[PDB]
PDB file of all heavy atoms in Angstrom:
ATOM      1  N   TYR A  12       0.830  -1.197   0.000  1.00 30.31           N
ATOM      2  CA  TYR A  12       0.000   0.000   0.000  1.00 30.31           C
ATOM      3  C   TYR A  12       0.868   1.251   0.000  1.00 30.31           C
ATOM      4  O   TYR A  12       2.004   1.253   0.482  1.00 30.31           O
ATOM      5  CB  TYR A  12      -0.936   0.028   1.211  1.00 30.31           C
ATOM      6  CG  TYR A  12      -2.142  -0.856   1.058  1.00 30.31           C
ATOM      7  CD1 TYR A  12      -2.118  -2.174   1.485  1.00 30.31           C
ATOM      8  CD2 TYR A  12      -3.306  -0.370   0.486  1.00 30.31           C
ATOM      9  CE1 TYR A  12      -3.225  -2.983   1.349  1.00 30.31           C
ATOM     10  CE2 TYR A  12      -4.416  -1.170   0.345  1.00 30.31           C
ATOM     11  CZ  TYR A  12      -4.370  -2.476   0.776  1.00 30.31           C
ATOM     12  OH  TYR A  12      -5.476  -3.278   0.635  1.00 30.31           O
ATOM     13  N   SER A  13       0.305   2.325  -0.544  1.00 31.16           N
ATOM     14  CA  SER A  13       0.946   3.636  -0.593  1.00 31.16           C
ATOM     15  C   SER A  13      -0.157   4.673  -0.754  1.00 31.16           C
ATOM     16  O   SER A  13      -1.290   4.346  -1.115  1.00 31.16           O
ATOM     17  CB  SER A  13       1.967   3.732  -1.729  1.00 31.16           C
ATOM     18  OG  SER A  13       3.053   2.844  -1.531  1.00 31.16           O
ATOM     19  N   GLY A  14       0.172   5.921  -0.460  1.00 32.98           N
ATOM     20  CA  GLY A  14      -0.768   7.014  -0.596  1.00 32.98           C
ATOM     21  C   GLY A  14      -0.901   7.828   0.681  1.00 32.98           C
ATOM     22  O   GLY A  14      -0.257   7.573   1.700  1.00 32.98           O
ATOM     23  N   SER A  15      -1.783   8.828   0.601  1.00 30.92           N
ATOM     24  CA  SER A  15      -1.913   9.799   1.682  1.00 30.92           C
ATOM     25  C   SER A  15      -2.699   9.232   2.855  1.00 30.92           C
ATOM     26  O   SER A  15      -2.418   9.556   4.013  1.00 30.92           O
ATOM     27  CB  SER A  15      -2.574  11.076   1.167  1.00 30.92           C
ATOM     28  OG  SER A  15      -2.684  12.035   2.200  1.00 30.92           O
ATOM     29  N   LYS A  16      -3.691   8.384   2.579  1.00 34.71           N
ATOM     30  CA  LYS A  16      -4.466   7.787   3.662  1.00 34.71           C
ATOM     31  C   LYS A  16      -3.692   6.661   4.335  1.00 34.71           C
ATOM     32  O   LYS A  16      -4.023   6.240   5.448  1.00 34.71           O
ATOM     33  CB  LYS A  16      -5.808   7.283   3.137  1.00 34.71           C
ATOM     34  CG  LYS A  16      -6.775   8.385   2.760  1.00 34.71           C
ATOM     35  CD  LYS A  16      -7.037   9.319   3.926  1.00 34.71           C
ATOM     36  CE  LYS A  16      -7.561  10.663   3.445  1.00 34.71           C
ATOM     37  NZ  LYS A  16      -8.687  10.507   2.483  1.00 34.71           N
ATOM     38  N   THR A  17      -2.656   6.153   3.667  1.00 32.41           N
ATOM     39  CA  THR A  17      -1.763   5.178   4.280  1.00 32.41           C
ATOM     40  C   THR A  17      -0.659   5.834   5.096  1.00 32.41           C
ATOM     41  O   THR A  17       0.262   5.144   5.542  1.00 32.41           O
ATOM     42  CB  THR A  17      -1.140   4.290   3.211  1.00 32.41           C
ATOM     43  OG1 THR A  17      -0.499   5.115   2.241  1.00 32.41           O
ATOM     44  CG2 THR A  17      -2.214   3.463   2.528  1.00 32.41           C
ATOM     45  N   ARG A  18      -0.702   7.155   5.261  1.00 33.14           N
ATOM     46  CA  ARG A  18       0.149   7.793   6.257  1.00 33.14           C
ATOM     47  C   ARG A  18      -0.571   7.881   7.599  1.00 33.14           C
ATOM     48  O   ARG A  18      -0.050   8.460   8.559  1.00 33.14           O
ATOM     49  CB  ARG A  18       0.595   9.168   5.758  1.00 33.14           C
ATOM     50  CG  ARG A  18       1.558   9.084   4.572  1.00 33.14           C
ATOM     51  CD  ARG A  18       1.442  10.277   3.634  1.00 33.14           C
ATOM     52  NE  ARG A  18       1.849   9.941   2.269  1.00 33.14           N
ATOM     53  CZ  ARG A  18       1.732  10.757   1.225  1.00 33.14           C
ATOM     54  NH1 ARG A  18       1.223  11.972   1.382  1.00 33.14           N
ATOM     55  NH2 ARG A  18       2.125  10.361   0.021  1.00 33.14           N
ATOM     56  N   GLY A  19      -1.780   7.319   7.675  1.00 31.06           N
ATOM     57  CA  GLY A  19      -2.529   7.181   8.911  1.00 31.06           C
ATOM     58  C   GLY A  19      -2.286   5.865   9.628  1.00 31.06           C
ATOM     59  O   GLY A  19      -1.139   5.514   9.917  1.00 31.06           O
ATOM     60  N   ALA A  20      -3.363   5.125   9.919  1.00 31.53           N
ATOM     61  CA  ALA A  20      -3.300   3.869  10.675  1.00 31.53           C
ATOM     62  C   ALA A  20      -3.121   2.695   9.712  1.00 31.53           C
ATOM     63  O   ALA A  20      -3.830   1.680   9.805  1.00 31.53           O
ATOM     64  CB  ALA A  20      -4.553   3.699  11.528  1.00 31.53           C
ATOM     65  N   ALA A  21      -2.127   2.822   8.819  1.00 30.89           N
ATOM     66  CA  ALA A  21      -1.858   1.830   7.792  1.00 30.89           C
ATOM     67  C   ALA A  21      -1.409   0.552   8.473  1.00 30.89           C
ATOM     68  O   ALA A  21      -1.703  -0.546   7.967  1.00 30.89           O
ATOM     69  CB  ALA A  21      -0.831   2.358   6.783  1.00 30.89           C
ATOM     70  N   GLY A  22      -0.717   0.624   9.609  1.00 32.66           N
ATOM     71  CA  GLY A  22      -0.598  -0.500  10.508  1.00 32.66           C
ATOM     72  C   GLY A  22      -1.962  -1.031  10.908  1.00 32.66           C
ATOM     73  O   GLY A  22      -2.763  -0.367  11.569  1.00 32.66           O
ATOM     74  N   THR A  23      -2.229  -2.236  10.391  1.00 30.64           N
ATOM     75  CA  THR A  23      -3.423  -3.077  10.502  1.00 30.64           C
ATOM     76  C   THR A  23      -4.639  -2.557   9.727  1.00 30.64           C
ATOM     77  O   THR A  23      -5.600  -3.314   9.546  1.00 30.64           O
ATOM     78  CB  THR A  23      -3.759  -3.380  11.985  1.00 30.64           C
ATOM     79  OG1 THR A  23      -4.082  -4.772  12.121  1.00 30.64           O
ATOM     80  CG2 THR A  23      -4.922  -2.532  12.554  1.00 30.64           C
ATOM     81  N   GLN A  24      -4.608  -1.346   9.151  1.00 32.69           N
ATOM     82  CA  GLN A  24      -5.669  -1.057   8.186  1.00 32.69           C
ATOM     83  C   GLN A  24      -5.213  -1.346   6.760  1.00 32.69           C
ATOM     84  O   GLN A  24      -5.829  -2.151   6.052  1.00 32.69           O
ATOM     85  CB  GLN A  24      -6.162   0.382   8.310  1.00 32.69           C
ATOM     86  CG  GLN A  24      -7.409   0.667   7.496  1.00 32.69           C
ATOM     87  CD  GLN A  24      -8.581  -0.212   7.887  1.00 32.69           C
ATOM     88  OE1 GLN A  24      -8.837  -0.436   9.070  1.00 32.69           O
ATOM     89  NE2 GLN A  24      -9.300  -0.714   6.891  1.00 32.69           N
ATOM     90  N   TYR A  25      -4.133  -0.704   6.315  1.00 30.37           N
ATOM     91  CA  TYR A  25      -3.572  -0.984   4.996  1.00 30.37           C
ATOM     92  C   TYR A  25      -2.084  -1.266   5.164  1.00 30.37           C
ATOM     93  O   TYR A  25      -1.230  -0.402   4.973  1.00 30.37           O
ATOM     94  CB  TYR A  25      -3.816   0.178   4.043  1.00 30.37           C
ATOM     95  CG  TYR A  25      -5.205   0.762   4.092  1.00 30.37           C
ATOM     96  CD1 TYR A  25      -5.410   2.080   4.488  1.00 30.37           C
ATOM     97  CD2 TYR A  25      -6.310   0.007   3.717  1.00 30.37           C
ATOM     98  CE1 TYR A  25      -6.676   2.623   4.522  1.00 30.37           C
ATOM     99  CE2 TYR A  25      -7.584   0.542   3.750  1.00 30.37           C
ATOM    100  CZ  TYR A  25      -7.759   1.850   4.152  1.00 30.37           C
ATOM    101  OH  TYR A  25      -9.023   2.387   4.187  1.00 30.37           O
ATOM    102  N   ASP A  26      -1.776  -2.510   5.513  1.00 28.98           N
ATOM    103  CA  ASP A  26      -0.399  -2.916   5.749  1.00 28.98           C
ATOM    104  C   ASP A  26      -0.041  -4.010   4.753  1.00 28.98           C
ATOM    105  O   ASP A  26      -0.919  -4.650   4.166  1.00 28.98           O
ATOM    106  CB  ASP A  26      -0.208  -3.344   7.209  1.00 28.98           C
ATOM    107  CG  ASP A  26      -1.249  -4.346   7.667  1.00 28.98           C
ATOM    108  OD1 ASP A  26      -2.186  -4.641   6.895  1.00 28.98           O
ATOM    109  OD2 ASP A  26      -1.131  -4.833   8.810  1.00 28.98           O
ATOM    110  N   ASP A  27       1.256  -4.222   4.566  1.00 29.38           N
ATOM    111  CA  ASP A  27       1.736  -5.161   3.569  1.00 29.38           C
ATOM    112  C   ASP A  27       1.491  -6.594   4.025  1.00 29.38           C
ATOM    113  O   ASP A  27       1.439  -6.890   5.222  1.00 29.38           O
ATOM    114  CB  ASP A  27       3.223  -4.942   3.304  1.00 29.38           C
ATOM    115  CG  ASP A  27       3.540  -3.505   2.930  1.00 29.38           C
ATOM    116  OD1 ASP A  27       2.662  -2.824   2.363  1.00 29.38           O
ATOM    117  OD2 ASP A  27       4.672  -3.053   3.204  1.00 29.38           O
ATOM    118  N   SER A  28       1.354  -7.488   3.053  1.00 29.75           N
ATOM    119  CA  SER A  28       0.991  -8.872   3.326  1.00 29.75           C
ATOM    120  C   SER A  28       1.802  -9.775   2.415  1.00 29.75           C
ATOM    121  O   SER A  28       1.943  -9.485   1.227  1.00 29.75           O
ATOM    122  CB  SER A  28      -0.507  -9.101   3.107  1.00 29.75           C
ATOM    123  OG  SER A  28      -1.278  -8.361   4.035  1.00 29.75           O
ATOM    124  N   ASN A  29       2.343 -10.848   2.971  1.00 26.72           N
ATOM    125  CA  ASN A  29       3.144 -11.806   2.224  1.00 26.72           C
ATOM    126  C   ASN A  29       2.343 -13.071   1.940  1.00 26.72           C
ATOM    127  O   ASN A  29       2.911 -14.135   1.680  1.00 26.72           O
ATOM    128  CB  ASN A  29       4.425 -12.136   2.983  1.00 26.72           C
ATOM    129  CG  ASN A  29       5.552 -12.570   2.072  1.00 26.72           C
ATOM    130  OD1 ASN A  29       5.676 -12.093   0.946  1.00 26.72           O
ATOM    131  ND2 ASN A  29       6.375 -13.491   2.553  1.00 26.72           N
ATOM    132  N   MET A  30       1.012 -12.933   1.914  1.00 26.87           N
ATOM    133  CA  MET A  30       0.079 -14.041   2.127  1.00 26.87           C
ATOM    134  C   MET A  30       0.159 -15.117   1.051  1.00 26.87           C
ATOM    135  O   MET A  30       0.137 -14.825  -0.146  1.00 26.87           O
ATOM    136  CB  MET A  30      -1.347 -13.496   2.191  1.00 26.87           C
ATOM    137  CG  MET A  30      -1.645 -12.665   3.418  1.00 26.87           C
ATOM    138  SD  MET A  30      -2.480 -13.626   4.687  1.00 26.87           S
ATOM    139  CE  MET A  30      -3.914 -14.186   3.773  1.00 26.87           C
ATOM    140  N   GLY A  31       0.249 -16.368   1.495  1.00 26.81           N
ATOM    141  CA  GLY A  31       0.198 -17.521   0.617  1.00 26.81           C
ATOM    142  C   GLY A  31      -0.976 -18.406   0.990  1.00 26.81           C
ATOM    143  O   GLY A  31      -1.458 -18.370   2.124  1.00 26.81           O
ATOM    144  N   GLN A  32      -1.439 -19.205   0.030  1.00 28.89           N
ATOM    145  CA  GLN A  32      -2.623 -20.026   0.235  1.00 28.89           C
ATOM    146  C   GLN A  32      -2.482 -21.345  -0.504  1.00 28.89           C
ATOM    147  O   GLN A  32      -2.099 -21.369  -1.674  1.00 28.89           O
ATOM    148  CB  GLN A  32      -3.886 -19.309  -0.251  1.00 28.89           C
ATOM    149  CG  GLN A  32      -4.469 -18.334   0.742  1.00 28.89           C
ATOM    150  CD  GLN A  32      -4.857 -19.007   2.033  1.00 28.89           C
ATOM    151  OE1 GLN A  32      -5.554 -20.018   2.032  1.00 28.89           O
ATOM    152  NE2 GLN A  32      -4.391 -18.461   3.146  1.00 28.89           N
ATOM    153  N   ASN A  33      -2.805 -22.437   0.180  1.00 29.41           N
ATOM    154  CA  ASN A  33      -3.029 -23.721  -0.462  1.00 29.41           C
ATOM    155  C   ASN A  33      -4.518 -24.027  -0.445  1.00 29.41           C
ATOM    156  O   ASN A  33      -5.141 -24.103   0.616  1.00 29.41           O
ATOM    157  CB  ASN A  33      -2.268 -24.851   0.234  1.00 29.41           C
ATOM    158  CG  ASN A  33      -0.778 -24.701   0.115  1.00 29.41           C
ATOM    159  OD1 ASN A  33      -0.290 -23.833  -0.603  1.00 29.41           O
ATOM    160  ND2 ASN A  33      -0.040 -25.559   0.805  1.00 29.41           N
ATOM    161  N   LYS A  34      -5.086 -24.209  -1.631  1.00 30.05           N
ATOM    162  CA  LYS A  34      -6.519 -24.407  -1.748  1.00 30.05           C
ATOM    163  C   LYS A  34      -6.778 -25.716  -2.464  1.00 30.05           C
ATOM    164  O   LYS A  34      -6.116 -26.038  -3.450  1.00 30.05           O
ATOM    165  CB  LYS A  34      -7.184 -23.267  -2.515  1.00 30.05           C
ATOM    166  CG  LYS A  34      -7.208 -21.958  -1.775  1.00 30.05           C
ATOM    167  CD  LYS A  34      -7.755 -20.855  -2.655  1.00 30.05           C
ATOM    168  CE  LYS A  34      -7.882 -19.553  -1.886  1.00 30.05           C
ATOM    169  NZ  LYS A  34      -8.491 -18.483  -2.718  1.00 30.05           N
ATOM    170  N   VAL A  35      -7.742 -26.472  -1.952  1.00 30.42           N
ATOM    171  CA  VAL A  35      -8.257 -27.639  -2.653  1.00 30.42           C
ATOM    172  C   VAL A  35      -9.741 -27.779  -2.343  1.00 30.42           C
ATOM    173  O   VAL A  35     -10.146 -27.924  -1.185  1.00 30.42           O
ATOM    174  CB  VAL A  35      -7.444 -28.910  -2.326  1.00 30.42           C
ATOM    175  CG1 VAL A  35      -7.195 -29.077  -0.830  1.00 30.42           C
ATOM    176  CG2 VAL A  35      -8.155 -30.129  -2.869  1.00 30.42           C
ATOM    177  N   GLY A  36     -10.566 -27.683  -3.372  1.00 32.21           N
ATOM    178  CA  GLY A  36     -12.001 -27.630  -3.167  1.00 32.21           C
ATOM    179  C   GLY A  36     -12.762 -28.172  -4.350  1.00 32.21           C
ATOM    180  O   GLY A  36     -12.355 -28.010  -5.504  1.00 32.21           O
ATOM    181  N   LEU A  37     -13.888 -28.805  -4.057  1.00 32.24           N
ATOM    182  CA  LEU A  37     -14.765 -29.377  -5.062  1.00 32.24           C
ATOM    183  C   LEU A  37     -15.726 -28.310  -5.557  1.00 32.24           C
ATOM    184  O   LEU A  37     -15.703 -27.164  -5.104  1.00 32.24           O
ATOM    185  CB  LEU A  37     -15.540 -30.572  -4.497  1.00 32.24           C
ATOM    186  CG  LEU A  37     -14.911 -31.970  -4.493  1.00 32.24           C
ATOM    187  CD1 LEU A  37     -14.582 -32.402  -5.904  1.00 32.24           C
ATOM    188  CD2 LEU A  37     -13.690 -32.097  -3.591  1.00 32.24           C
ATOM    189  N   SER A  38     -16.577 -28.700  -6.502  1.00 34.49           N
ATOM    190  CA  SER A  38     -17.612 -27.812  -7.016  1.00 34.49           C
ATOM    191  C   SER A  38     -18.716 -28.659  -7.621  1.00 34.49           C
ATOM    192  O   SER A  38     -18.450 -29.504  -8.476  1.00 34.49           O
ATOM    193  CB  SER A  38     -17.054 -26.844  -8.060  1.00 34.49           C
ATOM    194  OG  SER A  38     -18.102 -26.152  -8.713  1.00 34.49           O
ATOM    195  N   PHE A  39     -19.945 -28.432  -7.180  1.00 35.06           N
ATOM    196  CA  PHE A  39     -21.100 -29.159  -7.673  1.00 35.06           C
ATOM    197  C   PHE A  39     -21.967 -28.230  -8.508  1.00 35.06           C
ATOM    198  O   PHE A  39     -22.026 -27.023  -8.257  1.00 35.06           O
ATOM    199  CB  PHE A  39     -21.905 -29.738  -6.512  1.00 35.06           C
ATOM    200  CG  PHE A  39     -23.075 -30.565  -6.936  1.00 35.06           C
ATOM    201  CD1 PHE A  39     -22.892 -31.852  -7.400  1.00 35.06           C
ATOM    202  CD2 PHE A  39     -24.360 -30.056  -6.869  1.00 35.06           C
ATOM    203  CE1 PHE A  39     -23.968 -32.618  -7.789  1.00 35.06           C
ATOM    204  CE2 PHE A  39     -25.439 -30.815  -7.256  1.00 35.06           C
ATOM    205  CZ  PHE A  39     -25.244 -32.098  -7.716  1.00 35.06           C
ATOM    206  N   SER A  40     -22.633 -28.796  -9.509  1.00 35.18           N
ATOM    207  CA  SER A  40     -23.542 -28.023 -10.340  1.00 35.18           C
ATOM    208  C   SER A  40     -24.634 -28.938 -10.868  1.00 35.18           C
ATOM    209  O   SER A  40     -24.361 -30.071 -11.272  1.00 35.18           O
ATOM    210  CB  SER A  40     -22.807 -27.350 -11.501  1.00 35.18           C
ATOM    211  OG  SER A  40     -23.712 -26.624 -12.311  1.00 35.18           O
ATOM    212  N   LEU A  41     -25.861 -28.440 -10.870  1.00 39.11           N
ATOM    213  CA  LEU A  41     -27.001 -29.230 -11.304  1.00 39.11           C
ATOM    214  C   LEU A  41     -27.973 -28.351 -12.073  1.00 39.11           C
ATOM    215  O   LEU A  41     -28.668 -27.530 -11.466  1.00 39.11           O
ATOM    216  CB  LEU A  41     -27.702 -29.865 -10.105  1.00 39.11           C
ATOM    217  CG  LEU A  41     -28.726 -30.967 -10.373  1.00 39.11           C
ATOM    218  CD1 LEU A  41     -28.554 -32.069  -9.356  1.00 39.11           C
ATOM    219  CD2 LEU A  41     -30.144 -30.442 -10.316  1.00 39.11           C
ATOM    220  N   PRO A  42     -28.055 -28.485 -13.385  1.00 39.70           N
ATOM    221  CA  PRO A  42     -29.037 -27.699 -14.141  1.00 39.70           C
ATOM    222  C   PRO A  42     -30.454 -28.196 -13.924  1.00 39.70           C
ATOM    223  O   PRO A  42     -30.798 -29.305 -14.336  1.00 39.70           O
ATOM    224  CB  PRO A  42     -28.593 -27.886 -15.595  1.00 39.70           C
ATOM    225  CG  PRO A  42     -27.188 -28.384 -15.513  1.00 39.70           C
ATOM    226  CD  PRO A  42     -27.129 -29.198 -14.271  1.00 39.70           C
ATOM    227  N   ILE A  43     -31.283 -27.383 -13.276  1.00 39.25           N
ATOM    228  CA  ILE A  43     -32.651 -27.793 -12.988  1.00 39.25           C
ATOM    229  C   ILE A  43     -33.549 -27.549 -14.189  1.00 39.25           C
ATOM    230  O   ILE A  43     -34.231 -28.458 -14.674  1.00 39.25           O
ATOM    231  CB  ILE A  43     -33.181 -27.064 -11.743  1.00 39.25           C
ATOM    232  CG1 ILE A  43     -32.311 -27.394 -10.537  1.00 39.25           C
ATOM    233  CG2 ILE A  43     -34.623 -27.446 -11.485  1.00 39.25           C
ATOM    234  CD1 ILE A  43     -32.715 -26.671  -9.285  1.00 39.25           C
ATOM    235  N   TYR A  44     -33.568 -26.318 -14.684  1.00 40.75           N
ATOM    236  CA  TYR A  44     -34.414 -25.960 -15.811  1.00 40.75           C
ATOM    237  C   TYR A  44     -33.661 -24.977 -16.686  1.00 40.75           C
ATOM    238  O   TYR A  44     -33.160 -23.966 -16.190  1.00 40.75           O
ATOM    239  CB  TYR A  44     -35.730 -25.349 -15.338  1.00 40.75           C
ATOM    240  CG  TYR A  44     -36.626 -24.915 -16.461  1.00 40.75           C
ATOM    241  CD1 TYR A  44     -37.241 -25.847 -17.277  1.00 40.75           C
ATOM    242  CD2 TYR A  44     -36.862 -23.572 -16.704  1.00 40.75           C
ATOM    243  CE1 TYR A  44     -38.065 -25.455 -18.308  1.00 40.75           C
ATOM    244  CE2 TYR A  44     -37.686 -23.170 -17.731  1.00 40.75           C
ATOM    245  CZ  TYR A  44     -38.286 -24.117 -18.527  1.00 40.75           C
ATOM    246  OH  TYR A  44     -39.106 -23.722 -19.555  1.00 40.75           O
TER     247      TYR A  44
END
């Protein structure tokens, strides 16, 4: 993040994140009509 509003409470409002994710998920679908 950067900008003028990030010179405020950017700590925990707009702070940097190194976030990683492992995802595994199914998906169902059924055409009714």
Side-chain angles (χ1 to χ4, degrees):
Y12 282 91
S13 295
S15 181
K16 289 303 159 49
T17 55
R18 292 150 206 174
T23 224
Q24 190 59 43
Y25 316 117
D26 50 355
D27 306 332
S28 295
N29 207 34
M30 291 262 303
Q32 277 300 309
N33 294 352
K34 290 174 176 183
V35 47
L37 275 300
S38 170
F39 183 77
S40 179
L41 193 139
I43 300 177
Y44 178 70

